[PDB]
C-alpha cells in the first residue's frame, strides 16, 4: 500500500483542532448522533475494547458511540500486557509484525528479590515469553494504544468523540429499554449540551466511577492498601552494567523487597507527534495489516516516524508500588520538592541494589507535558459494589482495581469489557422486543452472573496481591512460592483455541489463576502467618521453612494432577519439568535478541531478518530460536502450526479452561 496523508492534510487545510481531526474519522460524522443503541462513557482502553468486541462479535447490530473528555488519547499509567491481550488483538486482525511497530516487545516476566537486612543479596525468578512464530506480549504507550483502538473502532462502524464530556448531573438512565438521555457537552462551561437518546449506557470512566458511584459508595478492603509513585527514564542500549545477573530489558522486570516492588518496563514513546500525523501512520499500519504485508517489507518504527513526521524515542517506565503502612521520615526535602519525587528518591537510596540499578537510567523531564516528571497515586485498591442496573453497566476500572502487579488491570479487566460487549446485544434486543417491566426483569436476571463475577473478582485479585506482597518479604518465598504458584495456576492453558466467540467465556475463567483452590490454600497460609510479623522486622527463618514446606507439599499433588503438557523446565529458568526448584539451574529457551544498532528487543523467526524498530539487517543465523531442552524439526513445526490462526467457532466444542486440571 502506498501511504496516504489524509488526516495530516485535512487538519492543515481546515486548521482543525486535535479533537476535530479525530472526530472527522467517524462513520456517522464529526458531530454527535441524535440516537444510538449504546453510549460508552470514557474511551480508555476498556471503553474501546468493549466497543471493538461488541461490533466484532455481532457486526451491524448495535449503533455505538464512545464519549471521551480528552481532546486526544491522553496519558495513562498501565503499560504491560499479556498473551491474552495479544490474542485479542490478533483475533481482531492485528498480529505481532504490526503491533511491534507501535509498541515494545515483552518476553515474559522476571523478578529480583532484594534482601533488606543483607544489602546486596538477591535472588531471582525468570520466565520467558514465546517464539516469534507463536505469539508476543506488548509494552504499550497508552496514548498510542487508545489511538490505535479509536481508529480501528471508527473503521468498524463505531463512532468515537474526543473532547466531549458526559454530564452526569443531567444525564437520565432508565431501565427496560425505555430510553436513556445521555447529556454530552464540551465541559462545565458549555452552554449547548447535546442529548443522545439510547438504550444502554456503559460506564467506562475508570477509577472515577462517574456513574456507578451514584449507586454505591466505593468499597475498600481490610488491611493496608498501596501507593504508587513513578517517572520516566532513558532506555540504555547497553544493559550490561545493570547490577542483576542475566537481566534483560524486554521483560516486565520486578524489583521486589519487604515494602513493595518496582516495575521496569522498556517501551517506545511517540510523544511530541501531531495527532493528525499519528492518525495517518496508524491508518497506514492497519491498511498494511489488511493487505498482509510481511514483516521484512513493513517499514521500521523509525522509518514510519520519518514518513509521517513523527517523534520517536525509547524510554523506561520505572515506578514504586509500596504498602501504605510504610513509615517515612517527616522531613524529605533532601530528595526533592514534590512528594512523588521525594518518596521515589528516598526509597531508591534505601536499597543499594536499587541505587546501583537506577544509576543506569537518566530521568526524563515532563515526557507527557508540564508537571509529568513525577506521578503519585495513593490508596490504589477499591471495588464498586454495584456494577449494573436498569439501563447501564460498568466495565474495567469502574468495576474495581487492585495493583499493577501481574497487570490484572488491562489483561484481567478485559474479561468484564468483553463479556459486557457480548451481553449488550441481547440487552438491547430484549428492550426492543418486550414490554418494559418484563424487559427490565429479564435483563436483571441475565446480568446476575456478570454482577456475581465482578463481586467475587476484585477480592480474589486482592488476595492474590497480598499473597505476592507478603512473600516478597523473603528471598525464598518470593520466587519459590508466590511466583511459582502464580505461573502454575495462571498460565493460559489452551489459549491457542480461543476465538472471538469463546473469548469472553475463556477470559472470565482465567483470573490469573487466583480462583484455583490450591492457589488460595497456599495464599491463605502465607498471609495468615506473615501478616503477624511487623513490617520493619525480618521474617523468622523457621516461618519461611514452614511456609516453603507447606507450599511444596500442596504443589507436588496439584502438578501431578494437571493434564496439560508443558516444557516447564524450558519456560521457568529456576525449575525442572515437575516445577521443582533447582538451585543452580540456568538453562531456558531463548526467543529474543537485542538489536546491535538501536538496542530494541526483537523476536527470533526466520522471516524477520531486519530489526522492526530501526530497520537494520541482522545476520541470518541470529533468527534461530534456541530450545533447551531441544525440539526436533517436527516438534517445532507442530508447535508453530498450532498457533498460526485461531479455530473457527464450533458451537459443539467444550471450552477448555486455562486453569490446571482438577484432581477430583
Ligand atoms: C501505578 C499503576 C500501574 C499500573 N500498571 C499496569 C500494567 O502494567 N498493566 C495493566 O494492565 N494495568 C496496569 N494498571 C491498571 C491500569 O492503569 C488500569 O486498569 C487501566 O488503565 C484501566 O483503564 P480503563 O479504560 O478502565 O479506564 P481509564 O484508562 O482510566 O479511562 C477512563 C476514561 O474515562 C474518561 N472520562 C472520565 N470522565 C468522563 C466524562 N464525564 N465524560 C467522558 N469521558 C470521561 C477519562 O478521560 C478517561 O479517558 C496500573 C495502575 C496503576 C495505578
Ligand atoms: C502459554 C504462553 C502464552 C505462556 N503463558 C505464560 C505465563 C507465564 C509464564 C510463561 C508463559 C507462557 C510461555 C508459553 C508456553 N507455551 C508453550 C507452547 C506455546 C507457548 C505459549 C506461551 C510458548 O511458546 N510459550
Ligand atoms: C457452559 C455454558 C452454560 C456457559 N457458561 C457461561 C459462563 C459465562 C459466559 C458464557 C457461558 C456459557 C455459554 C455456553 C458455552 N457452552 C458451549 C457448549 C455448550 C455451551 C453451554 C454454555 C453453550 O451452548 N453456551
Ligand atoms: Cl506483567
Ligand atoms: Zn534496530
PDB file of C-alpha atoms in Angstrom, residues 357-624:
ATOM      1  CA  UNK A 357      20.200  -0.134  39.189  1.00  0.00           C
ATOM      2  CA  UNK A 358      18.831   3.415  38.889  1.00  0.00           C
ATOM      3  CA  UNK A 359      22.335   4.720  38.157  1.00  0.00           C
ATOM      4  CA  UNK A 360      21.952   3.221  34.663  1.00  0.00           C
ATOM      5  CA  UNK A 361      18.974   5.468  33.903  1.00  0.00           C
ATOM      6  CA  UNK A 362      18.658   9.189  33.239  1.00  0.00           C
ATOM      7  CA  UNK A 363      15.489  10.980  34.270  1.00  0.00           C
ATOM      8  CA  UNK A 364      13.302  12.472  31.541  1.00  0.00           C
ATOM      9  CA  UNK A 365      11.700  15.832  32.329  1.00  0.00           C
ATOM     10  CA  UNK A 366       7.985  16.178  31.579  1.00  0.00           C
ATOM     11  CA  UNK A 367       7.741  13.496  28.912  1.00  0.00           C
ATOM     12  CA  UNK A 368       3.932  13.898  28.787  1.00  0.00           C
ATOM     13  CA  UNK A 369       3.762  17.674  29.218  1.00  0.00           C
ATOM     14  CA  UNK A 370       4.318  20.058  32.130  1.00  0.00           C
ATOM     15  CA  UNK A 371       4.053  18.591  35.603  1.00  0.00           C
ATOM     16  CA  UNK A 372       4.598  14.992  34.439  1.00  0.00           C
ATOM     17  CA  UNK A 373       8.183  14.307  35.521  1.00  0.00           C
ATOM     18  CA  UNK A 374       6.722  12.605  38.604  1.00  0.00           C
ATOM     19  CA  UNK A 375       3.425  10.898  39.359  1.00  0.00           C
ATOM     20  CA  UNK A 376       1.903   9.773  42.632  1.00  0.00           C
ATOM     21  CA  UNK A 377      -1.316   7.876  43.316  1.00  0.00           C
ATOM     22  CA  UNK A 378      -2.482   6.892  46.785  1.00  0.00           C
ATOM     23  CA  UNK A 379      -4.784   4.108  48.026  1.00  0.00           C
ATOM     24  CA  UNK A 380      -4.830   2.049  44.846  1.00  0.00           C
ATOM     25  CA  UNK A 381      -7.215  -0.834  45.598  1.00  0.00           C
ATOM     26  CA  UNK A 382     -11.030  -0.467  45.674  1.00  0.00           C
ATOM     27  CA  UNK A 383     -14.243  -2.124  44.470  1.00  0.00           C
ATOM     28  CA  UNK A 384     -17.568  -0.854  43.112  1.00  0.00           C
ATOM     29  CA  UNK A 385     -20.424  -2.691  44.900  1.00  0.00           C
ATOM     30  CA  UNK A 386     -22.969  -2.012  42.095  1.00  0.00           C
ATOM     31  CA  UNK A 387     -21.751  -2.634  38.533  1.00  0.00           C
ATOM     32  CA  UNK A 388     -25.068  -2.757  36.661  1.00  0.00           C
ATOM     33  CA  UNK A 389     -28.663  -1.668  36.880  1.00  0.00           C
ATOM     34  CA  UNK A 390     -31.636  -0.619  34.787  1.00  0.00           C
ATOM     35  CA  UNK A 391     -30.212   0.938  31.627  1.00  0.00           C
ATOM     36  CA  UNK A 392     -26.491   0.713  32.434  1.00  0.00           C
ATOM     37  CA  UNK A 393     -23.488  -1.420  33.302  1.00  0.00           C
ATOM     38  CA  UNK A 394     -19.847  -0.751  34.189  1.00  0.00           C
ATOM     39  CA  UNK A 395     -16.588  -2.231  32.873  1.00  0.00           C
ATOM     40  CA  UNK A 396     -12.857  -2.020  33.502  1.00  0.00           C
ATOM     41  CA  UNK A 397     -11.536   0.098  36.357  1.00  0.00           C
ATOM     42  CA  UNK A 398     -15.053   1.358  37.012  1.00  0.00           C
ATOM     43  CA  UNK A 399     -15.788  -2.108  38.487  1.00  0.00           C
ATOM     44  CA  UNK A 400     -12.725  -2.161  40.749  1.00  0.00           C
ATOM     45  CA  UNK A 401      -8.946  -2.354  40.782  1.00  0.00           C
ATOM     46  CA  UNK A 402      -6.130  -3.770  42.916  1.00  0.00           C
ATOM     47  CA  UNK A 403      -2.468  -3.223  41.954  1.00  0.00           C
ATOM     48  CA  UNK A 404      -0.113  -3.017  38.945  1.00  0.00           C
ATOM     49  CA  UNK A 405       1.496  -6.355  39.910  1.00  0.00           C
ATOM     50  CA  UNK A 406       0.929  -9.050  37.225  1.00  0.00           C
ATOM     51  CA  UNK A 407      -1.113  -6.469  35.264  1.00  0.00           C
ATOM     52  CA  UNK A 408      -4.684  -7.512  36.159  1.00  0.00           C
ATOM     53  CA  UNK A 409      -5.862  -4.010  35.187  1.00  0.00           C
ATOM     54  CA  UNK A 410      -5.865  -4.419  31.417  1.00  0.00           C
ATOM     55  CA  UNK A 411      -5.458  -8.168  30.965  1.00  0.00           C
ATOM     56  CA  UNK A 412      -7.908  -9.430  33.613  1.00  0.00           C
ATOM     57  CA  UNK A 413     -10.123  -6.351  33.353  1.00  0.00           C
ATOM     58  CA  UNK A 414     -10.873  -7.131  29.716  1.00  0.00           C
ATOM     59  CA  UNK A 415     -12.890 -10.141  30.894  1.00  0.00           C
ATOM     60  CA  UNK A 416     -15.553  -7.683  32.081  1.00  0.00           C
ATOM     61  CA  UNK A 417     -15.184  -5.480  28.977  1.00  0.00           C
ATOM     62  CA  UNK A 418     -15.564  -8.381  26.533  1.00  0.00           C
ATOM     63  CA  UNK A 419     -18.308 -10.191  28.471  1.00  0.00           C
ATOM     64  CA  UNK A 420     -20.273  -6.947  28.670  1.00  0.00           C
ATOM     65  CA  UNK A 421     -19.730  -6.441  24.941  1.00  0.00           C
ATOM     66  CA  UNK A 422     -21.291  -9.836  24.256  1.00  0.00           C
ATOM     67  CA  UNK A 423     -24.118  -9.285  26.766  1.00  0.00           C
ATOM     68  CA  UNK A 424     -25.034  -5.938  25.189  1.00  0.00           C
ATOM     69  CA  UNK A 425     -26.614  -7.440  22.070  1.00  0.00           C
ATOM     70  CA  UNK A 426     -29.397  -9.332  23.915  1.00  0.00           C
ATOM     71  CA  UNK A 427     -29.753  -6.457  26.416  1.00  0.00           C
ATOM     72  CA  UNK A 428     -30.645  -4.040  23.628  1.00  0.00           C
ATOM     73  CA  UNK A 429     -32.822  -6.531  21.765  1.00  0.00           C
ATOM     74  CA  UNK A 430     -34.739  -7.509  24.913  1.00  0.00           C
ATOM     75  CA  UNK A 431     -35.538  -3.828  25.352  1.00  0.00           C
ATOM     76  CA  UNK A 432     -36.755  -3.518  21.754  1.00  0.00           C
ATOM     77  CA  UNK A 433     -38.857  -6.702  21.817  1.00  0.00           C
ATOM     78  CA  UNK A 434     -40.733  -6.908  25.159  1.00  0.00           C
ATOM     79  CA  UNK A 435     -42.789  -4.507  27.305  1.00  0.00           C
ATOM     80  CA  UNK A 436     -40.867  -2.524  29.886  1.00  0.00           C
ATOM     81  CA  UNK A 437     -41.476  -4.469  33.117  1.00  0.00           C
ATOM     82  CA  UNK A 438     -40.632  -7.881  31.639  1.00  0.00           C
ATOM     83  CA  UNK A 439     -37.660  -6.467  29.729  1.00  0.00           C
ATOM     84  CA  UNK A 440     -36.207  -4.971  32.903  1.00  0.00           C
ATOM     85  CA  UNK A 441     -36.736  -8.254  34.771  1.00  0.00           C
ATOM     86  CA  UNK A 442     -35.197 -10.395  32.017  1.00  0.00           C
ATOM     87  CA  UNK A 443     -32.201  -8.066  31.734  1.00  0.00           C
ATOM     88  CA  UNK A 444     -31.687  -8.045  35.504  1.00  0.00           C
ATOM     89  CA  UNK A 445     -31.661 -11.860  35.533  1.00  0.00           C
ATOM     90  CA  UNK A 446     -29.330 -12.001  32.521  1.00  0.00           C
ATOM     91  CA  UNK A 447     -26.853  -9.786  34.387  1.00  0.00           C
ATOM     92  CA  UNK A 448     -26.791 -11.710  37.699  1.00  0.00           C
ATOM     93  CA  UNK A 449     -23.764 -13.792  36.575  1.00  0.00           C
ATOM     94  CA  UNK A 450     -21.993 -10.595  35.485  1.00  0.00           C
ATOM     95  CA  UNK A 451     -22.657  -8.896  38.830  1.00  0.00           C
ATOM     96  CA  UNK A 452     -21.615 -12.040  40.733  1.00  0.00           C
ATOM     97  CA  UNK A 453     -18.423 -12.470  38.705  1.00  0.00           C
ATOM     98  CA  UNK A 454     -17.488  -8.837  39.358  1.00  0.00           C
ATOM     99  CA  UNK A 455     -18.335  -9.057  43.068  1.00  0.00           C
ATOM    100  CA  UNK A 456     -16.015 -12.036  43.553  1.00  0.00           C
ATOM    101  CA  UNK A 457     -13.355 -10.921  41.031  1.00  0.00           C
ATOM    102  CA  UNK A 458     -11.756  -7.996  42.877  1.00  0.00           C
ATOM    103  CA  UNK A 459     -11.474  -9.807  46.266  1.00  0.00           C
ATOM    104  CA  UNK A 460      -9.738 -12.728  44.554  1.00  0.00           C
ATOM    105  CA  UNK A 461      -7.315 -10.283  42.898  1.00  0.00           C
ATOM    106  CA  UNK A 462      -6.794  -8.530  46.241  1.00  0.00           C
ATOM    107  CA  UNK A 463      -5.818 -11.802  47.945  1.00  0.00           C
ATOM    108  CA  UNK A 464      -3.525 -12.574  45.013  1.00  0.00           C
ATOM    109  CA  UNK A 465      -1.816  -9.198  45.507  1.00  0.00           C
ATOM    110  CA  UNK A 466      -1.395  -9.681  49.265  1.00  0.00           C
ATOM    111  CA  UNK A 467      -0.098 -13.217  48.706  1.00  0.00           C
ATOM    112  CA  UNK A 468       2.690 -11.912  46.487  1.00  0.00           C
ATOM    113  CA  UNK A 469       3.421  -8.903  48.729  1.00  0.00           C
ATOM    114  CA  UNK A 470       3.889 -10.900  51.930  1.00  0.00           C
ATOM    115  CA  UNK A 471       6.103 -13.420  50.125  1.00  0.00           C
ATOM    116  CA  UNK A 472       8.174 -10.563  48.729  1.00  0.00           C
ATOM    117  CA  UNK A 473       9.424 -10.095  52.314  1.00  0.00           C
ATOM    118  CA  UNK A 474      11.733 -13.104  51.884  1.00  0.00           C
ATOM    119  CA  UNK A 475      14.114 -14.036  49.063  1.00  0.00           C
ATOM    120  CA  UNK A 476      12.982 -17.676  49.115  1.00  0.00           C
ATOM    121  CA  UNK A 477       9.210 -17.185  49.463  1.00  0.00           C
ATOM    122  CA  UNK A 478       9.112 -14.657  46.617  1.00  0.00           C
ATOM    123  CA  UNK A 479      10.368 -16.931  43.822  1.00  0.00           C
ATOM    124  CA  UNK A 480       9.715 -20.434  45.162  1.00  0.00           C
ATOM    125  CA  UNK A 481       6.162 -19.878  46.471  1.00  0.00           C
ATOM    126  CA  UNK A 482       4.408 -16.718  45.301  1.00  0.00           C
ATOM    127  CA  UNK A 483       5.767 -16.552  41.753  1.00  0.00           C
ATOM    128  CA  UNK A 484       5.755 -20.318  41.304  1.00  0.00           C
ATOM    129  CA  UNK A 485       2.075 -20.556  42.226  1.00  0.00           C
ATOM    130  CA  UNK A 486       1.069 -17.562  40.099  1.00  0.00           C
ATOM    131  CA  UNK A 487       2.615 -19.056  36.985  1.00  0.00           C
ATOM    132  CA  UNK A 488       1.378 -22.595  37.632  1.00  0.00           C
ATOM    133  CA  UNK A 489      -2.181 -21.567  38.448  1.00  0.00           C
ATOM    134  CA  UNK A 490      -2.351 -18.719  35.938  1.00  0.00           C
ATOM    135  CA  UNK A 491      -0.621 -19.935  32.785  1.00  0.00           C
ATOM    136  CA  UNK A 492      -3.070 -19.691  29.882  1.00  0.00           C
ATOM    137  CA  UNK A 493      -3.739 -23.330  29.030  1.00  0.00           C
ATOM    138  CA  UNK A 494      -5.486 -23.861  25.654  1.00  0.00           C
ATOM    139  CA  UNK A 495      -5.195 -20.186  24.650  1.00  0.00           C
ATOM    140  CA  UNK A 496      -4.480 -21.348  21.090  1.00  0.00           C
ATOM    141  CA  UNK A 497      -8.138 -22.470  20.884  1.00  0.00           C
ATOM    142  CA  UNK A 498      -9.722 -19.137  21.830  1.00  0.00           C
ATOM    143  CA  UNK A 499     -11.663 -17.245  19.162  1.00  0.00           C
ATOM    144  CA  UNK A 500     -13.914 -14.175  19.113  1.00  0.00           C
ATOM    145  CA  UNK A 501     -16.905 -16.320  20.069  1.00  0.00           C
ATOM    146  CA  UNK A 502     -15.336 -18.004  23.108  1.00  0.00           C
ATOM    147  CA  UNK A 503     -13.070 -15.139  24.233  1.00  0.00           C
ATOM    148  CA  UNK A 504     -15.264 -13.649  26.975  1.00  0.00           C
ATOM    149  CA  UNK A 505     -16.139 -17.113  28.306  1.00  0.00           C
ATOM    150  CA  UNK A 506     -12.464 -18.102  28.408  1.00  0.00           C
ATOM    151  CA  UNK A 507     -11.239 -14.807  29.878  1.00  0.00           C
ATOM    152  CA  UNK A 508     -13.635 -14.888  32.841  1.00  0.00           C
ATOM    153  CA  UNK A 509     -12.285 -18.369  33.676  1.00  0.00           C
ATOM    154  CA  UNK A 510      -8.686 -17.126  33.908  1.00  0.00           C
ATOM    155  CA  UNK A 511      -8.303 -14.527  36.703  1.00  0.00           C
ATOM    156  CA  UNK A 512      -4.543 -15.223  36.628  1.00  0.00           C
ATOM    157  CA  UNK A 513      -5.346 -18.483  38.441  1.00  0.00           C
ATOM    158  CA  UNK A 514      -6.451 -16.578  41.562  1.00  0.00           C
ATOM    159  CA  UNK A 515      -9.606 -18.712  41.900  1.00  0.00           C
ATOM    160  CA  UNK A 516      -7.696 -22.005  41.706  1.00  0.00           C
ATOM    161  CA  UNK A 517      -8.311 -23.806  45.030  1.00  0.00           C
ATOM    162  CA  UNK A 518      -4.744 -24.955  45.736  1.00  0.00           C
ATOM    163  CA  UNK A 519      -3.511 -21.428  44.985  1.00  0.00           C
ATOM    164  CA  UNK A 520      -5.854 -19.905  47.559  1.00  0.00           C
ATOM    165  CA  UNK A 521      -4.943 -22.542  50.146  1.00  0.00           C
ATOM    166  CA  UNK A 522      -1.246 -21.677  49.894  1.00  0.00           C
ATOM    167  CA  UNK A 523      -2.015 -17.953  49.671  1.00  0.00           C
ATOM    168  CA  UNK A 524      -4.053 -18.078  52.879  1.00  0.00           C
ATOM    169  CA  UNK A 525      -1.429 -19.955  54.922  1.00  0.00           C
ATOM    170  CA  UNK A 526       1.239 -17.421  53.931  1.00  0.00           C
ATOM    171  CA  UNK A 527      -0.883 -14.306  54.521  1.00  0.00           C
ATOM    172  CA  UNK A 528      -2.127 -15.640  57.881  1.00  0.00           C
ATOM    173  CA  UNK A 529       1.471 -16.147  59.048  1.00  0.00           C
ATOM    174  CA  UNK A 530       3.365 -13.207  57.579  1.00  0.00           C
ATOM    175  CA  UNK A 531       0.788 -10.520  58.408  1.00  0.00           C
ATOM    176  CA  UNK A 532       1.599 -11.135  62.104  1.00  0.00           C
ATOM    177  CA  UNK A 533       5.258 -10.075  61.678  1.00  0.00           C
ATOM    178  CA  UNK A 534       5.603  -6.258  61.800  1.00  0.00           C
ATOM    179  CA  UNK A 535       6.812  -4.833  58.502  1.00  0.00           C
ATOM    180  CA  UNK A 536      10.032  -3.389  59.996  1.00  0.00           C
ATOM    181  CA  UNK A 537      11.075  -6.910  61.122  1.00  0.00           C
ATOM    182  CA  UNK A 538      12.631  -9.799  59.236  1.00  0.00           C
ATOM    183  CA  UNK A 539      10.582 -12.971  58.851  1.00  0.00           C
ATOM    184  CA  UNK A 540      11.860 -15.698  61.209  1.00  0.00           C
ATOM    185  CA  UNK A 541      13.787 -18.335  59.286  1.00  0.00           C
ATOM    186  CA  UNK A 542      11.534 -21.023  60.820  1.00  0.00           C
ATOM    187  CA  UNK A 543       8.437 -19.321  59.384  1.00  0.00           C
ATOM    188  CA  UNK A 544       9.979 -19.335  55.887  1.00  0.00           C
ATOM    189  CA  UNK A 545      10.921 -23.002  56.370  1.00  0.00           C
ATOM    190  CA  UNK A 546       7.405 -23.933  57.429  1.00  0.00           C
ATOM    191  CA  UNK A 547       5.730 -21.969  54.630  1.00  0.00           C
ATOM    192  CA  UNK A 548       8.131 -23.271  51.973  1.00  0.00           C
ATOM    193  CA  UNK A 549       7.493 -26.887  53.019  1.00  0.00           C
ATOM    194  CA  UNK A 550       3.710 -26.400  53.073  1.00  0.00           C
ATOM    195  CA  UNK A 551       3.727 -24.869  49.586  1.00  0.00           C
ATOM    196  CA  UNK A 552       5.875 -27.644  48.096  1.00  0.00           C
ATOM    197  CA  UNK A 553       3.633 -30.307  49.620  1.00  0.00           C
ATOM    198  CA  UNK A 554       0.453 -28.871  48.062  1.00  0.00           C
ATOM    199  CA  UNK A 555       2.376 -28.254  44.833  1.00  0.00           C
ATOM    200  CA  UNK A 556       3.501 -31.811  44.070  1.00  0.00           C
ATOM    201  CA  UNK A 557      -0.068 -33.159  44.118  1.00  0.00           C
ATOM    202  CA  UNK A 558      -1.554 -30.275  42.100  1.00  0.00           C
ATOM    203  CA  UNK A 559       1.214 -30.536  39.493  1.00  0.00           C
ATOM    204  CA  UNK A 560       0.728 -34.302  39.161  1.00  0.00           C
ATOM    205  CA  UNK A 561      -3.000 -33.708  38.642  1.00  0.00           C
ATOM    206  CA  UNK A 562      -2.551 -31.262  35.738  1.00  0.00           C
ATOM    207  CA  UNK A 563      -3.024 -32.953  32.356  1.00  0.00           C
ATOM    208  CA  UNK A 564      -1.548 -30.068  30.304  1.00  0.00           C
ATOM    209  CA  UNK A 565       1.827 -30.876  28.750  1.00  0.00           C
ATOM    210  CA  UNK A 566       4.305 -28.017  29.221  1.00  0.00           C
ATOM    211  CA  UNK A 567       8.092 -27.829  28.904  1.00  0.00           C
ATOM    212  CA  UNK A 568       8.191 -26.217  32.338  1.00  0.00           C
ATOM    213  CA  UNK A 569      11.980 -26.530  32.608  1.00  0.00           C
ATOM    214  CA  UNK A 570      12.290 -24.509  29.380  1.00  0.00           C
ATOM    215  CA  UNK A 571       9.847 -21.786  30.472  1.00  0.00           C
ATOM    216  CA  UNK A 572      10.940 -21.182  34.084  1.00  0.00           C
ATOM    217  CA  UNK A 573      14.694 -20.755  34.409  1.00  0.00           C
ATOM    218  CA  UNK A 574      14.929 -21.944  38.022  1.00  0.00           C
ATOM    219  CA  UNK A 575      12.667 -25.031  37.823  1.00  0.00           C
ATOM    220  CA  UNK A 576      12.690 -28.518  36.313  1.00  0.00           C
ATOM    221  CA  UNK A 577       9.924 -30.310  34.393  1.00  0.00           C
ATOM    222  CA  UNK A 578       7.869 -31.004  37.542  1.00  0.00           C
ATOM    223  CA  UNK A 579       8.198 -27.427  38.906  1.00  0.00           C
ATOM    224  CA  UNK A 580      10.785 -28.459  41.485  1.00  0.00           C
ATOM    225  CA  UNK A 581      13.200 -25.694  42.418  1.00  0.00           C
ATOM    226  CA  UNK A 582      16.750 -26.270  41.143  1.00  0.00           C
ATOM    227  CA  UNK A 583      19.387 -24.271  42.997  1.00  0.00           C
ATOM    228  CA  UNK A 584      21.805 -23.569  40.165  1.00  0.00           C
ATOM    229  CA  UNK A 585      19.686 -24.143  37.070  1.00  0.00           C
ATOM    230  CA  UNK A 586      20.197 -21.569  34.339  1.00  0.00           C
ATOM    231  CA  UNK A 587      19.001 -23.172  31.067  1.00  0.00           C
ATOM    232  CA  UNK A 588      15.933 -21.823  29.312  1.00  0.00           C
ATOM    233  CA  UNK A 589      14.553 -21.257  25.835  1.00  0.00           C
ATOM    234  CA  UNK A 590      15.787 -18.162  24.006  1.00  0.00           C
ATOM    235  CA  UNK A 591      13.148 -16.382  21.905  1.00  0.00           C
ATOM    236  CA  UNK A 592      14.526 -12.837  21.605  1.00  0.00           C
ATOM    237  CA  UNK A 593      17.653 -10.809  20.808  1.00  0.00           C
ATOM    238  CA  UNK A 594      18.723  -7.184  21.175  1.00  0.00           C
ATOM    239  CA  UNK A 595      19.416  -5.131  18.055  1.00  0.00           C
ATOM    240  CA  UNK A 596      23.080  -4.160  17.982  1.00  0.00           C
ATOM    241  CA  UNK A 597      22.124  -0.912  16.228  1.00  0.00           C
ATOM    242  CA  UNK A 598      19.300   0.705  18.209  1.00  0.00           C
ATOM    243  CA  UNK A 599      19.021  -1.500  21.328  1.00  0.00           C
ATOM    244  CA  UNK A 600      15.474  -2.655  20.568  1.00  0.00           C
ATOM    245  CA  UNK A 601      14.478  -6.189  21.517  1.00  0.00           C
ATOM    246  CA  UNK A 602      13.450  -8.450  18.642  1.00  0.00           C
ATOM    247  CA  UNK A 603      11.609 -11.739  18.221  1.00  0.00           C
ATOM    248  CA  UNK A 604      13.501 -14.587  16.557  1.00  0.00           C
ATOM    249  CA  UNK A 605      11.877 -16.104  13.469  1.00  0.00           C
ATOM    250  CA  UNK A 606      13.332 -16.863  10.028  1.00  0.00           C
ATOM    251  CA  UNK A 607      11.179 -14.403   8.062  1.00  0.00           C
ATOM    252  CA  UNK A 608      12.137 -11.374  10.247  1.00  0.00           C
ATOM    253  CA  UNK A 609      15.734 -10.732   9.201  1.00  0.00           C
ATOM    254  CA  UNK A 610      15.683  -6.968   9.871  1.00  0.00           C
ATOM    255  CA  UNK A 611      15.059  -5.043  13.073  1.00  0.00           C
ATOM    256  CA  UNK A 612      11.430  -3.887  13.133  1.00  0.00           C
ATOM    257  CA  UNK A 613      12.377  -0.718  15.060  1.00  0.00           C
ATOM    258  CA  UNK A 614      15.316   0.771  13.122  1.00  0.00           C
ATOM    259  CA  UNK A 615      15.405  -1.437  10.009  1.00  0.00           C
ATOM    260  CA  UNK A 616      18.977  -2.662  10.497  1.00  0.00           C
ATOM    261  CA  UNK A 617      19.551  -6.063   8.921  1.00  0.00           C
ATOM    262  CA  UNK A 618      20.731  -8.720  11.328  1.00  0.00           C
ATOM    263  CA  UNK A 619      22.636 -11.752  10.131  1.00  0.00           C
ATOM    264  CA  UNK A 620      20.561 -14.740   9.020  1.00  0.00           C
ATOM    265  CA  UNK A 621      21.749 -17.173  11.761  1.00  0.00           C
ATOM    266  CA  UNK A 622      20.648 -14.830  14.569  1.00  0.00           C
ATOM    267  CA  UNK A 623      16.992 -15.597  13.677  1.00  0.00           C
ATOM    268  CA  UNK A 624      17.341 -19.083  15.255  1.00  0.00           C
TER     269      UNK A 624
END
